[PDB]
Design a protein around this nucleic acid. Structure first.
Lengths: 286, 90, 537
DNA sequence: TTGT
DNA sequence: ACAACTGCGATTAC
């Protein structure tokens, strides 16, 4: 709080969501003793803060709901890209679709698709879409656009979700068996390209085989919700952790405001704010 | 199905698999430098988290590795009795 | 002014309502007594309702729970425990109580003004409205009740959940209409409504059948039961040279029903091929817009009504011509009836009036109706026929394999989409539907991944989508000059329920908007010849 | 930087 | 892209 030194409600240091700042004291102003013989309410009706020792602030976590999904920096932007390994699409295409406004034609392969674009990277939205949205009911257009061309962070999640690891390992084994017949006979450049492709295929096979039997889903590589560290661990004197947290919170609430304002809002503004949110998440993580 | 190209296995394990399996296993000796060796261990928290922490952490997280604390630094990080000397139950 | 002669004990006593056990008198104020508990209101006497589903005791219990003043039952009923008036009367006869539920003055007006009953297997509602329009053009205002809406008298129709409303409530509404706002109260019910007892407890001036066949065979348990019930109801109240027996002579049930009853009633046949009926089209003007025929009969009118169907609509027009000529011998009075028949009513709605290919809406919720409508459209259809329909979630799934095959057989291009999910996965029922033609959802999708979408071995193309709106839009955008599109999901319904949520967006206006806006997609360059649409770049 |  | 001795103590500047 301003010139009060008190935790703000529904904030980074909020007492309600994390816990009380003092042992036995609460934000409502009435002290209580935990474990007393007399019946005592665990939490004040007036104030959400529970009556407990303030050690919880050390071990208690939080989470910010994100309107637009974000992609983990470790999986995407490392030189070995697990996302680019699973999705045979090149790394440059994914980095563009994440950071530079582009479009992916078919992000879902398990649902019916009327449009026959079937393209990897759509460098522009100049394709006729205004006549298509007016023709169909506008609500209907919204309903199918997800199976249609998607942008930013929905295509990656739909590709990771709608995917058959068995088909992936089958196709990779087939391509491995095909390659290597006479590649070594060629030049050093061609042999190097064949070798790199073969190594990429082997890594893809290994990743898919591990994903099959590890009770872990590749869907979780793109973060729908971001956890928040316990308050005590980032105590405000103020830390950068918390500065980046405030930045991503501000960008996310601005994005949510723009989304909830009206559907007729310009796509450029919400897309730029999505890029800003994803860059803030990247700076926070790594 | 048993092994993939480019993998690293143990010499005794490779010989025992070659004796048992008719499937041709082509393996050649790679002398591994001290650093490389550490980065390739059974524990992702003791020897893998010494030079490239984030890389091995992301790899173990995506794989879902399970580490059995049979090493010293593993119990050191966990804050428990190290299975050395008086910590070895016999 | 809901009813009259139902707010006094003497009125019920004069109606031969003998319950053998009563407390005090029916001093409670009630506009019209209703046998059904739902039709009755609080503080109103409710007589016992006779029915297979609800007996007299259950009806009396429901009336006492709803707050009816009087409840009739075989045993002692404690109606005064949760009612506004302590006076009640328990009648041990359920049928007699249901008959006496309608007031004497209420039942006398509807029986004296006029009455026209039309109970047919197929094409009954098409002839009922035609007869109503003919009677209105004759100079007497009247209403015809249908399965969709209960209309005792008047142009307006009150909302009713069941196909046939309560007899007492229908009589009360007919009396209220005949008191002011209606000159005649004709009670028309289908075969099931006539067999239940809705139109049976009413003096019918004219009781003709549009199509006599096996109706309610699974419910009644015996063939020709509805026809026998209609004949008995007509013989109960019959007058000389007043009842009309206009029906197709080819149907044996029609002749069996005409044989029963008073022989002094006028009998006539509306068959076209039969020479004894003297009716015949004698014209070749069949078309999707209007099918005019020059009927040459001594009793029937010269001009005929423009029907959308080839044989069903023609038979309905021929059956209605007799009722139109019975009132007036001049054929000029049948112009309004012909216009109302060509007005494209609810059932099997005609094509839109916009400049475009044929787009028809049909209620093909059964395989037999779907195949019949497809044959009717193939008869008229000069070119490719496109159909779009869906099954119902939790409906009999036995229907699903056959229908898809029946559609793929006749139609060259078939688009399947989920008309009513009804708490079942849309893709889950589409797979069961495609199982009839031999395909699975995994294949379709794999074929779908391919641009090819290989055509059925018979040479027809099958297409699948999960959203009904986009499917209807693609079907209405994929058309030729002579090609026709047929929507068979909901002919006379505009409610779409996916799970718990219910939406009313589905309507014919959605299809008309597609025909209106297809010009933009055509100018832009989108290709709708196949389901994988080619787009620029 | 130095080398990996 | 990654890493390059181990710790301790003092000050001033934020």
């Amino acid at each position: 709080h301003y010139k009060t030194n008190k935790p703000e409600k529904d904030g980074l240091f909020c007492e309600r969501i994390f816990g009380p700042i003092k042992s036995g004291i609460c934000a409502c102003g009435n002290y209580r003793v935990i474990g007393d013989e007399k019946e005592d309410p665990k939490f004040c009706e007036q104030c959400g803060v529970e009556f407990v020792d303030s050690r919880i602030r050390r071990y208690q976590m939080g989470y910010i709901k994100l309107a637009c999904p974000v992609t983990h920096v470790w999986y995407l932007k490392r030189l070995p890209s697990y996302i680019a390994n699973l999705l045979d699409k090149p790394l440059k295409e994914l980095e563009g679709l994440v950071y530079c406004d582009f479009s992916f034609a078919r992000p879902i392969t398990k649902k019916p698709t009327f449009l026959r674009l079937r393209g990897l990277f759509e460098y522009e939205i100049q394709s006729w879409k205004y006549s298509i949205p007016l023709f169909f009911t506008t609500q209907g257009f919204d309903t199918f656009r997800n199976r249609e061309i998607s942008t930013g962070a929905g295509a990656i999640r739909e590709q990771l979700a709608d995917l058959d690891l068995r088909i992936i390992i089958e196709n990779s084994l087939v391509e491995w068996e095909e390659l290597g017949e006479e590649g070594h006979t060629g030049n050093e450049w061609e042999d190097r390209k064949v070798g790199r492709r073969k190594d990429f295929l082997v890594r893809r096979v290994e990743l898919a085989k591990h994903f099959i039997r590890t009770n872990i889903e590749p869907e979780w590589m793109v973060l729908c919700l971001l956890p928040v560290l316990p308050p005590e661990l980032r105590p405000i004197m103020s830390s950068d952790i918390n500065e980046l947290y405030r930045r991503v919170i501000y960008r996310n609430n601005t994005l949510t405001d723009l989304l909830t304002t009206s559907r007729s809002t310009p796509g450029e503004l919400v897309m730029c704010q999505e890029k800003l949110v994803q860059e803030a998440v990247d700076t926070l993580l790594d | 199905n048993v092994f993939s190209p480019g993998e690293l296995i143990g010499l005794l394990r490779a010989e025992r698999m070659g004796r048992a399996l008719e499937e041709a296993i082509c393996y050649r000796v790679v002398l591994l430098g001290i650093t490389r060796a550490s980065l390739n261990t059974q524990s992702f928290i003791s020897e893998a988290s010494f030079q490239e922490t984030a890389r091995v952490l992301a790899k173990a997280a995506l794989r879902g590795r399970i580490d059995w604390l049979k090493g010293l630094k593993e119990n050191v990080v966990l804050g428990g009795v190290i299975p050395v000397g008086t910590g070895f139950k016999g | 002014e809901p009813k009259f002669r139902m707010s006094l004990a003497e009125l019920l006593d004069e109606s031969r309502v003998v319950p053998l056990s009563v407390y005090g008198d029916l001093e409670v104020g009630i506009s019209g007594v209703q046998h059904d508990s739902r039709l009755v209101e609080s503080g109103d006497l409710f007589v016992c309702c006779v029915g297979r589903k609800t007996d007299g005791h259950l009806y009396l219990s429901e009336a006492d729970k709803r707050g009816a003043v009087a409840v009739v039952a075989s045993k002692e009923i404690d109606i005064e425990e949760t009612l506004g008036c302590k006076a009640l009367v328990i009648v041990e006869d359920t049928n007699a109580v249901l008959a006496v539920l309608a007031a004497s003055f209420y039942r006398h007006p509807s029986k004296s003004m006029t009455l026209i009953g039309i109970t047919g297997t197929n094409g009954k509602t098409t002839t009922s409205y035609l007869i109503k329009a003919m009677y209105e053009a004759m100079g007497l205002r009247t209403g015809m009740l249908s399965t969709v809406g209960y209309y005792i008298y008047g142009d307006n129709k009150l909302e009713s959940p069941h196909t046939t409303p309560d007899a007492v409530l229908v009589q009360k509404l007919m009396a209220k209409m005949v008191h002011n706002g209606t000159e005649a109260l004709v009670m028309e019910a289908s075969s099931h409504g006539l067999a239940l007892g809705r139109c049976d407890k009413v003096d019918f001036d004219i009781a003709v059948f549009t199509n006599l066949t096996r109706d309610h065979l699974d419910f009644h348990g015996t063939e020709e039961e509805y026809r026998d019930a209609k004949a008995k109801l007509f013989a109960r109240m019959v007058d000389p040279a007043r009842h009309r027996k206009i029906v197709n002579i080819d149907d044996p049930n029609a002749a069996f029903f005409l044989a029963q009853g008073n022989p002094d009633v006028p009998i006539v046949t509306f068959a076209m091929e039969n020479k004894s009926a003297d009716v015949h089209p004698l014209k070749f003007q069949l078309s999707l817009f209007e099918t005019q025929v020059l009927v040459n009969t001594p009793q029937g009118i010269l001009e005929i009504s423009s029907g959308l169907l080839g044989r069903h609509n023609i038979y309905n027009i021929l059956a209605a011509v007799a009722v139109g000529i019975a009132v007036g011998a001049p054929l000029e009075d049948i112009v309004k009836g012909i216009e109302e028949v060509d007005a494209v009513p609810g059932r099997c709605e005609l094509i839109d009036e916009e400049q475009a290919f044929g787009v028809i809406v049909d209620y093909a919720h059964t395989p037999d109706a779907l195949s019949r409508l497809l044959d009717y459209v193939r008869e008229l259809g000069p070119r490719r026929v496109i159909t779009v329909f869906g099954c119902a979630g939790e409906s009999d799934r036995g229907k699903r394999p056959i229908m898809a095959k029946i559609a793929t057989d006749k139609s060259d291009v078939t688009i399947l989409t989920s008309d009513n999910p009804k708490t079942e996965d849309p893709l889950d029922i589409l797979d069961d539907m495609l199982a009839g033609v031999g395909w699975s959802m995994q294949d379709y999708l794999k074929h779908g991944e391919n641009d090819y979408y290989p055509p059925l071995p018979n040479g027809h193309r099958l297409f699948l989508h999960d959203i009904r709106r986009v499917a209807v839009r693609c079907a209405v955008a994929m058309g030729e000059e002579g090609d026709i599109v047929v929507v068979a999901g909901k002919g006379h319904e505009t409610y779409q329920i996916e799970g718990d949520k219910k939406e009313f967006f589905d309507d014919r206006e959605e299809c008309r908007e597609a025909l209106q806006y297809v010009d933009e997609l055509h100018q832009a360059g989108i290709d709708t010849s196949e389901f994988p649409w080619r787009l620029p770049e």
